Design a binder for this molecule. Sequence first.
Ligand code: 3AT
Ligand code: 3AT
Ligand code: MG
Length: 372
Amino acid sequence: RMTWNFHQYYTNRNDGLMGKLVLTDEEKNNLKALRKIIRLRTRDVFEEAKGIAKAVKKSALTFEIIQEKVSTTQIKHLSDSEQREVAKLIYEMDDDARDEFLGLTPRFWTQGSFQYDTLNRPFQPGQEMDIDDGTYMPMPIFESEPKIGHSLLILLVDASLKSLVAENHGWKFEAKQTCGRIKIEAEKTHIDVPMYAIPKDSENVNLALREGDRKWINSDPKIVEDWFNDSCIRIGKHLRKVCRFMKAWRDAQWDVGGPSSISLMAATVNILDSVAHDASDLGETMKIIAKHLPSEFARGVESPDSTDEKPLFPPSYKHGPREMDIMSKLERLPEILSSAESADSKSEALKKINMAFGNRVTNSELIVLAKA
Ligand SMILES: Nc1ncnc2c1ncn2[C@@H]1O[C@H](COP(=O)(O)OP(=O)(O)OP(=O)(O)O)C[C@H]1O
Ligand SMILES: Nc1ncnc2c1ncn2[C@@H]1O[C@H](COP(=O)(O)OP(=O)(O)OP(=O)(O)O)C[C@H]1O
Ligand SMILES: [Mg+2]
């Protein structure tokens, strides 16, 4: 009953997979420095725009003079039509709207894998690590439209990010449906900035959407943060590790694409909550996760936010080529792991398990002969 054991292959912080995935302190500090840069500029742009609104409260300035004031701020890094729109929105505000804007100071909170500590070093060329830093606009509760304006809020956050891109060589701006993004290719890094409306201080946490039908959706990122932290407490310290490993698998199997990180987390928590496993052998634990993921994904992976009816990964009847590919690779994973376990030699064991996680771990002495 001889096997190969991979517990150190997975967990070793020198040169096992944890060692290869976890950011160095310098890398983490660089991301925190990037976050601060964005936060300070967003703060500044809002103070600048408020200064113009303050002037208009004092005196009903002409549109031309408001434009001139806009053009001397960071908003100058938007397009001509975008600057005109900002000036027009400030010109068009009634007294109550203007007073609400003059009271607005954006707040910030990091979400995603930087926040709950599952951010992996990227693997393939082109792949990037990111930090997701949300900007929050405290304002009165609204049903349909806020008393400051979706359009103005997005223009000002865009102005912030674009002003930074203009000042930093090798930085590039990208608009997404749920965020503005600064990409820094040479640093294999981007920062995503989702924007939320919240009350002036979960049902009233509203994510801004860039294009389409709905300008807002109720999506409180703290629901996911709290669910995952609670899950780590409930299941144990290995949950963060196996979530990292499943994301590393995804990065190795797909250059571009694959299932979302949050779908992997949700399915893995469901499996570990409901299936016996042993944290002293994370090789066996990974095999157990891999055996059960196909069924989790085939039925559709539900969001931990119960108010979100949209699945994190759709059920089988809604699959196209991409979802079919994901199912195929999920089905292959337990077979890869099983073959690695019974390989003829340590070097073949390493070669095989690296077909799941990529050729990152090279130290075959992390794999030891065992019985199972
Ligand atoms: N479909 C979704 N439903 C609800 N929240 C989502 C969804 N996709 C992303 N989020 C929110 O955004 C956060 C960041 O997402 P994302 O960058 O995809 O994951 P992550 O956990 O940061 O993993 P990576 O390490 O970046 O791959 C996590 C969650 O609070
Ligand atoms: N409820 C939500 N639904 C979707 N995305 C969300 C939600 N809440 C926050 N986000 C933001 O979306 C970001 C990742 O979304 P996504 O648009 O899938 O980027 P991606 O994973 O690079 O894929 P694409 O760039 O869209 O192909 C991370 C997070 O900051
Ligand atoms: Mg992220």
